[PDB]
Amino acid sequence: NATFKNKEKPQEVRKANIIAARSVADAIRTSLGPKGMDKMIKTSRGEIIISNDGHTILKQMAILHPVARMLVEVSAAQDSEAGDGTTSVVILTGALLGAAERLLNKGIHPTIIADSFQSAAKRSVDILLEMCHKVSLSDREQLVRAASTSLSSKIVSQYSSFLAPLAVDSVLKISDENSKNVDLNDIRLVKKVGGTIDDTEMIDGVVLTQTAIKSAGGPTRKEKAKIGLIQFQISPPKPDTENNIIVNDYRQMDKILKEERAYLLNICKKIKKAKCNVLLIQKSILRDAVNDLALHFLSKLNIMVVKDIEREEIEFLSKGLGCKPIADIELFTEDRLGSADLVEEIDSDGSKIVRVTGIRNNNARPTVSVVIRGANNMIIDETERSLHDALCVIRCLVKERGLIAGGGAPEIEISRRLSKEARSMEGVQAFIWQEFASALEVIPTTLAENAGLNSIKVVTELRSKHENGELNDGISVRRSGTTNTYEEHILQPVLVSTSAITLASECVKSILRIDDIAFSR
Amino acid sequence: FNNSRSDTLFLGGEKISGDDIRNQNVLATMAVANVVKSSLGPVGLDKMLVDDIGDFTVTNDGATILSLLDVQHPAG
Amino acid sequence: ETRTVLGGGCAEMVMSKAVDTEAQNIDGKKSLAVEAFARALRQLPTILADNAGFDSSELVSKLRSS
Amino acid sequence: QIFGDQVTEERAENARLSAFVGAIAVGDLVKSTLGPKGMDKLLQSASSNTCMVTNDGATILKSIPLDNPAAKVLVNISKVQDDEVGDGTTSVTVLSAELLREAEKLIDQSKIHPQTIIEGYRLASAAALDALTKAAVDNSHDKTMFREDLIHIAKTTLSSKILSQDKDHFAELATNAILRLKGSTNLEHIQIIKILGGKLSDSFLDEGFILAKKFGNNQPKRIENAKILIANTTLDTDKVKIFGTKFKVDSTAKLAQLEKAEREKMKNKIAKISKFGINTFINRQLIYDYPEQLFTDLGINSIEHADFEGVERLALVTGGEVVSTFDEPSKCKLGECDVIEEIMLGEQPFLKFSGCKAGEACTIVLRGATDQTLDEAERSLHDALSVLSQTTKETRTVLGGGCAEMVMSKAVDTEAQNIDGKKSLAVEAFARALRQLPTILADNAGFDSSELVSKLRSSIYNGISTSGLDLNNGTIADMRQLGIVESYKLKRAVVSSASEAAEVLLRVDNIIRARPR
């Protein structure tokens, strides 16, 4: 018969890209699971880094092949949406790339392969959603239990009892129950050296990262105070031409002080006219936030000053306080000021943190500013990472309610159901669905290999047990074998698995669509 | 001896994994152990360490030997 | 505007048929070039089918015959 | 390592590349020699003391050694042209090379097995041969002179044979048996009846078809308006081999009953015949009394022991067919015969068939004294008929100068439209291969091949055109007016041989390396 000539040879480039991507996927595969092998990479600066994080490993590998870099984007998307499983998505991408290579060896056009993989991924997502265990955000106890389960895998173990409710409350403050998509970036985590893990605060308002006026006369706190964001500095004018202060006798100090005080007094009067009692000034590398004379005059005005505030902190304050930044004193008005019940500095050794409470701003977002404390850098880093992971898990639950037992059980169940269903398919679709189902078994195989268990035995036992169960039977590290992972408290949000499958399918489609590369110089 | 020109996995540098890297790490640790074994026990024998300038020191202190022992390997 | 032609290679095949008809009522030297132009026009649906991942030759031959 | 002795199978890619390209390259050895204006080729020996220059394609092919096995196969297949015609080997080789090149181009465009290409080439060759037959002309005018020549040839051939008893009578019989056929002169169209009880000079001529071994036990001796269908069924002596079979019976009576039931099971097939509108039935094997009665109840005549040669000849004269099963009613091809008579010649039964549909056959009745005389007479008649058949093969000519070839190419192109898309490409490739011949002829003549080929194609396509290539003036002229014609037999043989050669190599996947000699 007669078919397409296929004069060109895009297959060479496609296969080279697939080989590179599969090599990267195989390199990242061995890190899956709690017992994943550690990877050591020497950076271009000579630093030696050992970590089991897929995203960090990919970043440090410095991938050069343009197609292989797609795995970095896949991991970034997984972190943004799921927050975990960067190794799982890479492993799935590698398995699907191998299946695509096998299909190509059978003479199937790349477009057919991509379309069939997209359809199979959609079917797998639907199947997994149908079998999920329903959850409800209104159950605070359930969210606390989920957060504790997620935190149990971190360094912090006994303080999870306090970390879990903190995360649950922080996520609920912005997600309510039917908010659908919720951005977890609205929760700000601040680390400070000192104290212990239990010394954490949620603060429904916003928390600053700097101390209050340390000089004499500083209020250090104010009740019924309006808060504004300042990007300029309270300093005397500095003409672009030559200018400086020269003093040869103390008699000139009177004139210099009078001039500087007059200018700073004009600035402070403009500030006061707006009735602003808390000055949040953005950090600058050119000049100090407020001059000493200006600080004294503000103290006479009972105006609290907080300086050295980072740009990110200013943006978070604007999002949470509902106020707007002031480019210059000329634009300083009252309409751009907040109103907090009490802004004060917590005078304690090692924290000295200023916090804002009682914003009572309807136009402002319900932001959360969590305070993280710890005697050592390791304590604060681990606490922040565990809290971030818990917040991400709860956010994933909010976006798509449901929990799926881990250990590869959902992958095996999806593979079995897809294998059963493909018998009704016809043409290349049936073969591609069968290949997709076979590739889906990569995750449990990798988990078994990393756990030191016999892959064949583990997969056979899982399939045999799935004759009665659907998702509760999976690989458990604690039992070192196939057991009821649901009873073992090993569950992940449905969103994580669905996003992993979708990202793997999209990455496979993108890779298969590449047929040539050219330089643009 | 060493793996190179893999023609695949185009990264910023070379990659060694599996039995090869495991054996390399084990051999490096064994070399360190062979260097430091002679100092074990009060009846053991000392060793001489030479810097890159031309000076040297003799001591039987295991901690000092390990601190001054230059091992160019992550296992070291 | 608002003027269109049948898609899916139908316009290309109609143009190819017209060119082939022209190729008959012309001398050989220009007839060969006319046939070449018709082939070039027919190549477009072949590439379209190729990009769609189907049997390009079968579809092109069937469309031309129809 | 496989095989040995420098004879090993080559890689599939390289094997196919050799099979096609090397075979095509054989044409290049003789392509320049095509036509009367072909070029000369120099063949140099190792010693250089026996080098010679020749323009004969056969000599070039047979003298130049061919190391590639594909070239050997192509030359061996094309050798049939020398025995069949003895000329035109260059044309056969060129056409085969062009067909192979077109098939290679198609494969490069499909990368699929050439079985579909083989089928398309078969269809295109059949269409081209039909067109060539339609375009042929007859130069057998004055058929009376041809008849006289046939009589003289028959008399010459009958000398020194047993038929010399009546030389004129047997010459007339032989001449008539060829002339009155008005078609194929093969011996299958001529039947010989060998009976005793007379002299060879008493031989009678019967234009009808006569068979022996009359049929039927209760069947009528005359059949009119017969609808004839032939089948191969075992209606007599069912269960031929039963020795050693264990029968769960109490006596032979139950075994006989089982055999009777098995015979009755054929009643369904017997009845299915009546649904075709058939009133005459012919069976290769004998028919038992029970099936005969079943046919009688249906009003169908039962003819027995038709064997194979009898079946073939009866179907050919009546235009029928032979089948083994009746899958569906009303789906079959039926022959016709106006009258069938039961006759006995020489105390031997015979069946006479008259009024056969478009029947083209003759029968000669021989009355001999012994077996030797009848056998010698039959052999002499066969030899005389074979010699006389030469007149029906000559005088058949087609327009030369590529006119017939261009008409065949146009017919193939027409066939390329009334066919599935997966074979239109193959049909067009065959048409291009056919068209390649006039291009090479023009090139060898030193003229602009493209212009002449395009003009000839346009002229032939534009209706009743008899124009062709003028290799003397380098233009297009009317072949019929100039009297430029070429033998129909030569063109038909060349095209058939080229098609067969292309088919032989197309079906080959891999070729084993030839052993150097």
Curated annotation (Swiss-Prot), chain A:
It comes from the Eukaryota. CDD domains: TCP1_delta (cd03338). GO terms for cellular component: chaperonin-containing T-complex. It is found in: Cytoplasm. Its main location: cytoplasm. InterPro entries: Chap_CCT_delta, Chaperone_TCP-1, Chaperonin_TCP-1_CS, Cpn60/GroEL/TCP-1, GroEL-like_apical_dom_sf, GROEL-like_equatorial_sf, TCP-1-like_intermed_sf, TCP-1_chaperonin. Keywords: ATP-binding, Chaperone, Cytoplasm, Nucleotide-binding. Disulfide bonds: none annotated. One of its GO terms (biological process) is protein folding. GO terms for molecular function: ATP binding; ATP hydrolysis activity; ATP-dependent protein folding chaperone; unfolded protein binding. Gene3D superfamilies: GroEL (3.50.7.10), GroEL-like equatorial domain (1.10.560.10), TCP-1-like chaperonin intermediate domain (3.30.260.10). It holds the Pfam family Cpn60_TCP1. Present with 5530 molecules/cell in log phase SD medium. PANTHER family: CHAPERONIN (PTHR11353). Molecular chaperone; assists the folding of proteins upon ATP hydrolysis. Known to play a role, in vitro, in the folding of actin and tubulin. In yeast may play a role in mitotic spindle formation. Belongs to the TCP-1 chaperonin family. Heterooligomeric complex of about 850 to 900 kDa that forms two stacked rings, 12 to 16 nm in diameter. This is T-complex protein 1 subunit delta.
UniProtKB/Swiss-Prot annotation, chain B:
It is found in: Cytoplasm. Transmembrane segments: none annotated. Molecular chaperone; assists the folding of proteins upon ATP hydrolysis. Known to play a role, in vitro, in the folding of actin and tubulin. In yeast may play a role in mitotic spindle formation. Heterooligomeric complex of about 850 to 900 kDa that forms two stacked rings, 12 to 16 nm in diameter. Belongs to the TCP-1 chaperonin family. This is T-complex protein 1 subunit alpha. It comes from Saccharomyces cerevisiae (strain ATCC 204508 / S288c) (Baker's yeast). The gene is TCP1.
From Swiss-Prot, chain C:
Transmembrane segments: none annotated. It is found in: Cytoplasm. It comes from the Eukaryota. Molecular chaperone; assists the folding of proteins upon ATP hydrolysis. Known to play a role, in vitro, in the folding of actin and tubulin. In yeast may play a role in mitotic spindle formation. Heterooligomeric complex of about 850 to 900 kDa that forms two stacked rings, 12 to 16 nm in diameter. Interacts with PLP2; this interaction leads to inhibition of CCT complex mediated actin folding. Belongs to the TCP-1 chaperonin family. This is T-complex protein 1 subunit beta.
